[PDB]
A paper describes a structure:
To explore the consequences of removing α8, presumably an early event in separation of the core and latch domains, we crystallised the BimBH3mini:BaxΔC28 complex and determined its structure. C-terminal truncations that remove more of α8 cannot be expressed.
The intrinsic pathway to apoptosis is regulated by interactions between members of three factions of the Bcl-2 protein family: the BH3-only proteins such as Bim and Bid, which initiate the process, the essential effectors Bax and Bak, and the prosurvival members, which oppose the action of both other factions. Core/latch dimers of Bax and Bak form on treatment of the monomeric proteins with certain BH3 peptides and CHAPS, and Bax and Bak core domains form symmetric homodimers, supporting that unlatching the core domain is a necessary step to Bax and Bak oligomerisation and permeabilisation of the MOM. Bim and Bid are both potent direct activators of Bax, but Bim is less dependent on interactions via its ‘h0' residues than is Bid.
Numbering used by the authors:
A (entry chain B), B (entry chain B): 144 to 159
C (entry chain A), D (entry chain A): 10 to 37, 48 to 164
Amino acid sequence: PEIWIAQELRRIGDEF
Amino acid sequence: PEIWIAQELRRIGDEF
Amino acid sequence: GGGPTSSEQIMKTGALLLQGFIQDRAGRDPVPQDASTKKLSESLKRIGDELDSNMELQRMIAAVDTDSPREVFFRVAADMFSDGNFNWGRVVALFYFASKLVLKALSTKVPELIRTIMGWTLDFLRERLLGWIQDQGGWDGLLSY
Amino acid sequence: GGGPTSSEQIMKTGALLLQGFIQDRAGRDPVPQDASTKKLSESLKRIGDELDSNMELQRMIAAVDTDSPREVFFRVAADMFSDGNFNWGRVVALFYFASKLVLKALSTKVPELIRTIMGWTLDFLRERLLGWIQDQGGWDGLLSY
């Protein structure tokens, strides 16, 4: 769940 | 100043 | 066994009334209350609400150096009843002060939290991100991106 | 001496940007910024604002057991850059998470504060007010008053 957040921030970061 | 507060709460309490 | 005059009910009801009261003043979870306790609560909110309008009091609560909110509480509590008198008005005003102390304490505790969390973030930045940030020519790189 | 690529500016500007950013997300004091830093800040608020609208993310940030907000931060920070890549998007998202962590931490720290302040109030009540409260027949005395 900490990890969900990590993957989502990465995804979002990369997408920007 | 702590004391101001104390006297005011007493005053208010007693007045009620 | 154990009615209203018992120390147990006094502490129990006292805890529910105070907790309810503090949460109530923090509006500007809830707490489980039977019927009579709820009635006591209205008989507290009225007083809390009036005191909220005492602008002078608010300024002096704001001005208190709260390096030690516990010392502040007991000094105030001690000075309030030092003449040896009691009434319900004083007890309630004391409860009022406690709820205000909570709000005040955050106002001192919360910058601390930011600094701490910042500490972690910047620790990580120095050790993990900084090399890459330098390769961009520092934060000026972000203006472009 | 000491321009944008220097570790000193990176940490200094980094600290101002993060502090400004966190305070900015806590709206829902300020921070001193020269012109360019202010420009960087707008280039962060936009991203922060978009992320605020990611409802799924918000739910998962809310669901995190934050018994150890520091462990949480470093686990998230570590997992984010574990593939060895960097870009500004990730750095900003990390800053976003930190500001959210502050808000979350209070949400755990603040009940604690109430319990503590309550502890003082009820300690005082037991030892200083209770005799008088019993003489009134307990809190039922207050309904009448």
